[PDB]
C-alpha cells in the first residue's frame, strides 16, 4: 500500500546513510591506520567489510520500493548474492568471536596457537567459503520479472516448497547452529567468570579479559534482539504455507506487512558495530 511505499524508502535511506558512514569509518580506522588489531578487532573488521558490502546495495532496493526496477537481471542477481553472503558471514563471524572468547577465558595459557590458527586460516574456510557456496540458489533463481506496469526483482522458484525450504535453511544456518555455539561458549564463560576468583594468575589479565568480553556480549545480544521478530514472522509465514495456520486473507495480509516492516527494521544490524564502537570507545 501507499503507507509501505512511503515508509520503506525512508528507513532504507536512513540505514544506508548510517551504515555507509559507520562502516567506512571503522574500515578506514582499522585498515591503513593500523590501530589496535587483537583477534576481536580482526573479526569486527571482517564484519564491517561484510556489512558495508551489503549496505552498498540499499539505494537499488529503495528505488525498487518507490517506483520500479530499471537496473537489470545482472544487478538483481548481484544484490541477492551480496545479501546472502552478508547474512551468513555476519552471524558466523559472531560465532567465531564467541568461540575465541571461550578459548581465551577457559584455557587462558595454552590457547595462543589454536586462537592464532582459528583467526588466521580457519576463519576463511569456516565463514566465507560456505557462504559463497550457499549462493548457488541465488545465482540460479534470482531474476527480473515483467509484472503489470513495472519490473520485479525477486528470487523465482518453481513453487512455494522451495520458498519454505530456503526459509527453513536460512533460519537454521543463521540462528540455530551459530546460536547453539554462542550459547554453549557463553554459558561456560559466564560460569567461569562468576566463580573464578582470578582468571589466569594476575589481576590485570582478569580485568582485561572482562573488559574485552563485555562489548561482545552486548553486540551479540543486540544482534539477536534485532533479528528475532523477523524470524518469528517468517516462521509464522512458513507455517501458513505449510497449511498449519488456517485463517482468512486478512490474516495473511497482516503477517505480510508485519514481516515487511520487521525486516526493514531488522536490517539495522549493519549499524551495530560502529554505534557500539562509538559509545563504548570514548
Amino acid at each position, epitope marked *: 500500500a501507499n503507507f509501505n511505499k512511503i515508509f520503506l524508502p525512508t528507513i532504507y535511506s536512513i540505514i544506508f546513510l548510517t551504515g555507509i558512514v559507520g562502516n567506512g569509518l571503522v574500515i578506514l580506522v582499522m585498515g591503513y591506520q593500523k590501530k589496535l588489531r587483537s583477534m576481536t578487532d580482526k573479526y569486527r573488521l571482517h564484519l564491517s567489510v561484510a556489512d558495508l558490502l551489503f549496505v552498498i546495495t540499499l539505494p537499488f532496493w529503495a528505488v525498487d520500493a518507490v517506483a520500479n526496477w530499471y537496473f537489470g537481471n545482472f544487478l538483481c542477481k548481484a544484490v541477492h548474492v551480496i545479501y546472502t553472503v552478508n547474512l551468513y558471514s555476519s552471524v558466523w563471524i559472531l560465532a567465531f568471536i564467541s568461540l575465541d572468547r571461550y578459548l581465551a577465558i577457559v584455557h587462558a595459557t595454552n590457547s595462543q596457537r589454536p586462537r592464532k590458527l582459528l583467526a588466521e586460516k580457519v576463519v576463511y574456510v569456516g565463514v566465507w567459503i560456505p557462504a559463497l557456496l550457499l549462493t548457488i540458489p541465488d545465482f540460479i533463481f534470482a531474476n527480473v520479472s515483467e509484472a503489470d506496469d513495472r519490473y520485479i526483482c525477486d528470487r523465482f522458484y518453481p513453487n512455494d516448497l522451495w520458498v519454505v525450504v530456503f526459509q527453513f535453511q536460512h533460519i537454521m544456518v543463521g540462528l540455530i547452529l551459530p546460536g547453539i555455539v554462542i550459547l554453549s561458549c557463553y554459558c561456560i564463560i*559466564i560460569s567461569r*567468570l*562468576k566463580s573464578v*576468583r*582470578l582468571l589466569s594468575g594476575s*589481576r590485570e589479565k*582478569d*580485568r582485561n579479559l*572482562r*573488559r574485552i*568480553t*563485555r562489548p561482545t556480549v552486548i553486540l551479540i545480544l543486540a544482534f539477536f534482539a534485532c533479528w528475532l521478530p523477523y524470524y518469528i514472522g517468517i516462521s509464522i509465514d512458513s507455517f501458513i504455507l505449510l497449511e498449519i495456520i488456517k485463517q482468512g486473507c486478512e490474516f495473511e495480509n497482516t503477517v505480510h506487512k508485519w514481516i515487511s516492516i520487521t525486516e526493514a527494521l531488522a536490517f539495522f544490524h549493519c549499524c551495530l558495530n560502529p554505534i557500539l564502537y562509538a559509545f563504548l570507545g570514548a
Partner: nanobody
Framework: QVQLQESGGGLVQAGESLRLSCAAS????????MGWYRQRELVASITSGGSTKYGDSVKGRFTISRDNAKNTVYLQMSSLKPEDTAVYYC???????????????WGQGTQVTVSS
C-alpha cells in the same frame, strides 16, 4: 561501594573467650577471601571454600569461621598469650560486578586488650 564494620573488642578479663565480627554491606556481587591482619602478617585467613591458612604462632589456638549467607567472619580467641594483645584489622576481597576487576577492602580496626 561496600561497608565493613568491626566489633567485639574491648577490655576483658584474662583467660576469657571473645568472638570478633565483621559484616560487609553494600553493592556486593561475590566475596572471595576474608582474613584478619596484624608488613601486615595474615594471622588468619579463610577462603570462600574454607581453605583456612593460619599463622605459625596462632595455629592450634584460634578458630576462624565464615557464614556466606550471613556475610560475616568470626574469629574465636582461646588460650590467651601476652603477644596476642594488638589491633585486629578485618580484610575482605569483593567484586561489585561480573565485568569488574577484583576489588580489595579493609576494616575499621578492632582494639583487643589483654593483661600481660
Amino acid at each position: 561501594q561496600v561497608q565493613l564494620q568491626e566489633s567485639g573488642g574491648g577490655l576483658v578479663q584474662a583467660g576469657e573467650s571473645l568472638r570478633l565480627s565483621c559484616a560487609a554491606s553494600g553493592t556486593i556481587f561475590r566475596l572471595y577471601d576474608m582474613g584478619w591482619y596484624r608488613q601486615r602478617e595474615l594471622v588468619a585467613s579463610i577462603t570462600s571454600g574454607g581453605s583456612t591458612k593460619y599463622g605459625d604462632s596462632v595455629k592450634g589456638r584460634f578458630t576462624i569461621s565464615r557464614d556466606n549467607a550471613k556475610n560475616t567472619v568470626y574469629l574465636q580467641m582461646s588460650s590467651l598469650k601476652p603477644e596476642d594483645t594488638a589491633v585486629y584489622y578485618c580484610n575482605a576481597e569483593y567484586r561489585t560486578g561480573i565485568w569488574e576487576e577484583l576489588l580489595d577492602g579493609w576494616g575499621q580496626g578492632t582494639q583487643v586488650t589483654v593483661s600481660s
